[PDB]
Amino acid sequence: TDGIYAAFDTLMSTAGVDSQIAALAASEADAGTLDAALTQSLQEAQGRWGLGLHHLRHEARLTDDGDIEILTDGRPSARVSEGFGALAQAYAPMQALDERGLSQWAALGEGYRAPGDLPLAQLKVLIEHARDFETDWSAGRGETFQRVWRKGDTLFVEVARPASAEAALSDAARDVLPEAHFTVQAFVQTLSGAAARNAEEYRAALKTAAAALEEYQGVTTRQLSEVLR
Amino acid sequence: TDGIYAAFDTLMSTAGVDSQIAALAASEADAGTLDAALTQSLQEAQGRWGLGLHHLRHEARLTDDGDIEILTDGRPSARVSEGFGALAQAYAPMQALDERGLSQWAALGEGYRAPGDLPLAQLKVLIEHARDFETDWSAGRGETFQRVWRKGDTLFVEVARPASAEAALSDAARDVIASIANLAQLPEAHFTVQAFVQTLSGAAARNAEEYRAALKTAAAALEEYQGVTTRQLSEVLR
């Protein structure tokens, strides 16, 4: 019934996106307002899930049969009514994760990717004077991984810490359902305008993305610590 | 019509481009082969004329009436039957030259351009690790200027030494007389060699030392083509 908007909201919560879609529908929002918000929410969620599909366009839309269709590059690939397990399966063959759980796809697709361990003084040059560019993954502060890319006027700063469903669910027990398919594994901080050509803003964006990542992974750990009697 | 091809070849000579359109047409080459040779010649010429129109696609084609049409971004600009001055005039409003005679347009158009005074250490990073990028003009050796940009898989290195047609033509005249008459009808009244753009691809296009050597190759090509065209014009004047 009206549980389709709730089901989507639930999906979004696995990513720490507070979509508020049921509330939007309840307000009697038109279909186009609903579709724009569904899509904006999904796009945020893709940045958190760590699936590694930045190179694909993500959309979600209302269908006549009361379902929510999820598209990648314009092709439908799943329906929300199908459940969260099916969404995961639809995404899986598009993914290319390495042994660290880090996507191997480039975010800009096809082209030169710079090393992930450039000197900051050289990375600075890309940031200030390059056009589009992209960096391979590298380790970063505190058990995280990080990479950066620019597309247009926007700099995207990705910080990731891959963490299986087991690894969290479990690790919450060291204190003495949807999260089985999706969880917050990464955070992408965006910069634009002058800030996207400022290497010190980049460095601060890493710290911002890392803190927001750990806050988001902290909450999932609490649920699986209180759901533990 | 014989004269149309010859006219085109003469225009090309002002950039030291030996286009051989008259000989190619006399062998009765087909329209596709001729059009390709016309276009390749014009693109080469544009690199040396220093008009500053790298952001535009340049083409030339045979017409039905036996003419040659010159286009910029698919739009007809002038036909060779109109004369060398008509083509110069069509280009003029597309140009944007600064005080020094250097073009103000970017080669990549619309987007971020790096400043011209960049340290070599920084330029080296762009060359090795960026994708597309562009630099404004910087000072080079011996009164030249220089800039560099990458588009896709190709690195472009431009060295220029701006020079009006009047300067080039009068220098030729001065040296001819000193060594011993409708000037208006020469193609050199409107066109002269001001620049050379050297190209690098594949791995060399991301190699700092290939770039340094392209700067010198480009400078030396500028000398060579200013040399050949000056000698060519002087012979006519003699």
Q: H/E element holding B68?
A: strand B68-72
**Full residue range of the structural domain in which residue A147 is found:** 120-226
Contact call for A131 and B132, based on CB within 8 A:
yes
State how far the alpha carbon of A193 is from the alpha carbons of A128, A132, A197, in Å. Answer: 11, 14, 7
The answer to the question of residue A153 being in a domain is yes
Residues B35 and B76 in one domain: yes
- Cβ neighbors of B144 (< 8 A, separation 6 or more) are B159, B160, B161, B219, B222
The answer to the question of residue B198 being in a domain is yes
Residue B118 in contact with partner chain A when CB distance is under 8 A: yes
Looking up tokens 């890319």 gives: A149
Rounded to 5 degrees, what are φ and ψ at B78? -170, 160
Residue B112 in contact with partner chain A when CB distance is under 8 A: yes
Looking up tokens 């001001």 gives: B194
The answer to the question of residue B115 being in a domain is no
The answer to the question of residue A78 being in a domain is yes
User: Using only C-alpha atoms, what is the Rg of chain B?
Assistant: 19
Contact call for A129 and B133, based on CB within 8 A:
yes
> SS3 string of chain A?
CCHHHHHHHHHHHCCCCCCCHHHHHHCCCCHHHHHHHHHHHHHHHHHHHCCCCCCCCEEEEECCCCCEEEEECCEEEEEHHHCHHHHHHHHHHHCCECCCCCECCCCCCCCCCECCCCCHHHHHHHHHHCCCEEECCEECCCCCEEEEEEECCEEEEEEECCCCHHHHHHHHHHCCCHHHCCCCCEEEEEEEHHHHHCHHHHHHHHHHHHHHHHHHHHHHHHHHHHCCC
Of B94, B112, B133, which one is at a domain's C-terminal end? B94
Residues B222 and B134 in one domain: yes
**Which residue of chain B has the CA closest to A149?**
B130
The answer to the question of residue B144 being in a domain is yes
Of A79, A94, A109, which one is at a domain's C-terminal end? A94
- Cβ neighbors of A15 (< 8 A, separation 6 or more) are A44, A45, A48, A49, A182, A184
Of B94, B110, B138, which one is at a domain's C-terminal end? B94
Total domains in the fold of chain B: 2
Long-range (24+ apart) CB contacts under 8 A made by B134-141 are B134/A131, B134/B106, B134/B107, B134/B108, B137/B102, B140/B215, B140/B219, B141/B219
The answer to the question of residue B180 being in a domain is yes
Residues A75 and A137 in one domain: no
Residues A139 and A73 in one domain: no
Closest among A130, A178, A169 to A153, alpha carbons compared: A130
Structure determination technique employed: X-ray
Rounded to 5 degrees, what are φ and ψ at A108? -90, 0
Residues A198 and A152 in one domain: yes
The answer to the question of residue B76 being in a domain is yes
Residues A125 and A60 in one domain: no
Name the minimum distance, in Å, from the CA of B123 to any CA of chain A: 8
| Strand, helix or coil for residue B18 | coil
Residue A63 in contact with partner chain B when CB distance is under 8 A: no
Residue A75 in contact with partner chain B when CB distance is under 8 A: no
Residue A228 in contact with partner chain B when CB distance is under 8 A: no
State how far the alpha carbon of B30 is from the alpha carbons of A53, B23, B43, B121, B180, in Å. Answer: 49, 13, 20, 50, 45
